[PDB]
Amino acid sequence: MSNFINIHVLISHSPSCLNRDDMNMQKDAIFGGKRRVRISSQSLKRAMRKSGYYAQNIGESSLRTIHLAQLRDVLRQKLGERFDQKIIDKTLALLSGKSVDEAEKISADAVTPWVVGEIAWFCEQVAKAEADNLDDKKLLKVLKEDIAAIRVNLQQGVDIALSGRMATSGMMTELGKVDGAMSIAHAITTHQVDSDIDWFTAVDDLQEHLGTQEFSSGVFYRYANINLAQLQENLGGASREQALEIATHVVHMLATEVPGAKQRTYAAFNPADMVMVNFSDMPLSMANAFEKAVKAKDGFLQPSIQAFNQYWDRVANGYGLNGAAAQFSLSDVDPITAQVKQMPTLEQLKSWVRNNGEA
Template sequence: MTRRLYIDVHVVQTIPPANTNRDDQGNPKEATYGGVRRSRVSSQAWKRATRLHFDDQAPETDRASRTKRIISELTARIARNTGVDRDAATRIATTLLAQLGLSQGKKAGDTAYLLFYGNAQLDTVAALVTDNATDLAAMDDKALTEAVEELHVAEAFSTGHPVGVALFGRMVADIPKLNVDAATQVAHAISTHETQLEFDYYTAVDDRNEQDETGAGMIGTIGFNSATLYRYATVGLAQLTDNLGGDTDAALGALDTFIDSFARSVPTGYQNSFAHRTRPALVAVVVRTDQPVNLVSAFEEPVSADAGIQASSASRLAEEHLTAKQVWGDTPLFEAASHTFTPRDPKAKDTVEAITQAFGEPVTFADLRASLRARLTTVAGEPA
């Protein structure tokens, strides 16, 4: 697939009092937009939540890992596959990965930075020495280095990318051959309205207090806020297909997985304290051929809380999309929305009408994904 196709995903989602993504002071992250303070959840936080969500649904070999402890991970595989002892497996693993030129970290055995790889890719590297690990373990360091230098370690990380690496890419500044261009961009989620930082003052009582003892065993505070968030991500299908070795079916499957997990996932910061997991009120998907378009300008003027914020935010988003089509002459290849608003609710009637006018008749989330895949499958079979 060579034609440019960008799949934009727009989400409106309300999060109750929570601290899903904290700053260096331990408070919820914020940003100034439209002249007021907004709640913010970083793109990195939601990327990781999305990746963990789709990894949870996948077999172990199809998952990705991001770690400084790649030598230890390879050591475990070599020891398990060959039966050599841990020390011997560590020598072999270290020598194999030395071919990549990874900078060493401060802690022995760690790399200087997190390396993002597929579990199946590391399995491939381990398999390179399965048949001769015992012989390699008996060699001195010089002979071991010479024995493994012809093995294609770097190539193992250049193909067979898992969904996570194919979508989010891999950046290794000093080793360009390991880089993978990301197929996905994820915006920082921001509230559609002004927010105020609040604090929960909490105490914990010692269950073993004597009867005459009073007071708390611990006192503390946690910063929190609540917000209706606008979330946005876009996927370049051509880049995703290229990252997956030109396999269009695999790319469409990865796209479907991403949309499902991006919509359903929530960063887990302080989740036991706030139980803040919700699902979106609106998910809209637009396929464009020119460029990705973030619709955050719909909320440059903050939504006011006259009678709730969620429905007004969804209306604003729909109106911004419709206006952009009219002004710029956009003709998306596909547009659809799934939402929880019902015209039976007088307060939501205008919202439903706005969404329908902008994205068409609403569909279930499952039907949205299915119709998107069907449309892209048809497009993939057409001449570029």
């Protein structure tokens, strides 16, 4: 069975500014010696994480913070009916490596992802360890013996199972180190973009000074893959089918979710025009299809999709890629040759993915 699942997406956006930096400038990148517009992988990740679809098909997002005071209070309110305050405080203090007073500000080393399910589990363990006069060190060494038992709790924090976590303080260094299952790339345009500039003003209704905003439209190449085995491992040993279902939701989200930036004023609410999913032993990206920046003819979209299809033909024949592959597209013109099953709707695609690429 194939371990890696690759998700390729071509999605065209109308004039927008979906990701910018500390100087209100669009994020770009250089590719093939020409400037592409860029949407950072962080942006995509958090857009997916916090989306509504995630909330309805995957669950609650992890709670990412650095303020342990607020976190203390939160954990009390959401767990108080299950544990003594002092078990909670002690668990937080052991995980974080800081002391949980009634101090107003208590800051961790960095912004870390916390999962309330996980913290609860640790609270149980700390409780029985409290009842047994077991010392903190021995508690640690004990817990280190069965890691999977802790990773099961990441089913209430699937995003962490996808993008991972690092720790530099507390027992989390030994316990809460998670290795991301999903690799995801910055989205870049398949063509050159010279951004436009909107010169604006604000009218003062009581009297009778121009600002600027950079923007652009563009056809974007999104890529991500998922390491099934590592996902299963990161979820406590979950099934391949549960893995495939999560991977499916990631396909959906990568084909429909869009960062929120400047959207109320530019509304680039576009859906993907092509989505290909492809099963593989070694993960590969199709970015090179657009190393030679796509030149427009009757748009950027069609030539980008054709460029994609061609590169995939060359790479698949050249490197002998026998893996399940399927392509959904809103365009009619000529797709990838017959080893790529065509999908009329996105849902048929997603079914085909849920079914390990055989349906």
